[PDB]
């Protein structure tokens, strides 16, 4: 009946991250979490919480915590926030307007950029409508951009919806990969299983 530390190491220090269009979610429960330790970790150049101060998180208990993680390029980090628009916020990973969690991001050029490009990190370029908050769309159907059906064949007005980042070490920080972790806190009519120290 011993309470263990939450496995944040498995999220923040995973060898590879998911593509943003297929963003990973880790459900965290029945453990003790030290959020102030994460907050004071200097390599987290982006650490932002909404409606709550990051040092208050250690005083709170929740039913579950969700850790979403993925990779985007540097100049898209600002889209991982409530009320944002753009290709990532609209078509890949959407936060709700009333979000009250935290967003963490750090440069991952050394891990995710590859000589010759890392084309395995992808994002959705074409989509007909915006994602709902916390929606994950992994469809690879040919995108119909005209009045004629595509029938699964790319061509005029018929495009593959996913595009590769192709991360390379020689890109500037705006186009280098950044690993992102989004923490959401869930409160239900149930005993809380995740508390701070």
């Amino acid at each position, epitope marked *: 009946h011993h309470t263990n530390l939450c496995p944040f190491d498995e999220v923040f220090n995973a060898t590879r991250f998911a593509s943003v269009y297929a963003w990973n979610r880790k459900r965290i429960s029945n453990c003790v979490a030290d959020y102030s330790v994460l907050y004071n970790f200097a390599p987290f150049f982006a650490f932002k919480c909404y409606g709550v101060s990051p040092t208050k998180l250690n005083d709170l208990c929740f039913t579950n915590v969700y850790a979403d993680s993925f990779v985007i390029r540097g100049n898209e980090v600002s889209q991982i926030a409530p009320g944002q628009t753009g290709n990532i916020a*609209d078509y890949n990973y959407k936060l709700p307007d009333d979000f009250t969690g935290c967003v963490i991001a750090w440069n991952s050029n050394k891990l995710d950029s590859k000589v010759g490009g890392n084309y395995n990190y992808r994002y959705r370029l*074409f989509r007909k409508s*915006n994602l709902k908050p916390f929606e994950r769309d992994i469809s690879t159907e040919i995108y119909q951009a005209g009045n004629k059906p595509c029938n699964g064949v790319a061509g005029v*007005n018929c495009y593959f919806p996913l595009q590769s980042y192709g991360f390379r070490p020689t*890109y*500037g920080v705006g186009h280098q990969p950044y690993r992102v972790v989004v923490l959401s806190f869930e409160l239900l009519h149930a005993p809380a299983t995740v508390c701070g120290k």
Partner: antibody
Amino acid sequence: EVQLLESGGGLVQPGGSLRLSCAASGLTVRSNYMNWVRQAPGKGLEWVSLIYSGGSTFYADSVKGRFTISRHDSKNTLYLQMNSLRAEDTAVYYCARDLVVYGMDVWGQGTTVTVSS
Amino acid sequence: DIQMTQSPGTLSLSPGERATLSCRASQSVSSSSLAWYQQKHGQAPRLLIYGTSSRATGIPDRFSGSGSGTDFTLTISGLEPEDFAVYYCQQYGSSPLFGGGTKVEIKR
């Protein structure tokens, strides 16, 4: 038959308003990134406004607060509402379909806007 | 804010010669975010090259593109009379951003 056809350009005095239209065929404005791009006399191309298929809109700083991009899905037509026009808004205005990684592959012929007293 | 600079402002070459147009970005960017457009006098622009090196539909083989990071090049291997026009590069950052353009004129 993939083409874009602008209209609505003309002469307006400073401070006036003007609404441009861009009728599409083949491609559907509802499903595409669509741009307005202008060119002042003897100058280069300047991107002005963008609308996503999902509805998000973006504007150049030079037209923020004054221009509004929109579309009519059934009419398959793109619009640019231009308010509080200034002399430096005088240009040929092009609409274009944007494929981003595949470039702006379809361009209209342009419609001319002249702002002068 | 990224900045795109094209050089030279005017390129004077004879028909049949190899043309090299430069487009430089103030920040090192992916080659998939850089495109080239051709504009003849009195006409609308038309897409020439997308993704730094891919020719758009109907563009002849004498047009080629290359570059990496900050320095991008449009090459015309043997200028034809119709090729003498203005060429714009364009980068996809926070928004589409066009370079200032290079005019290719006939040297006689």
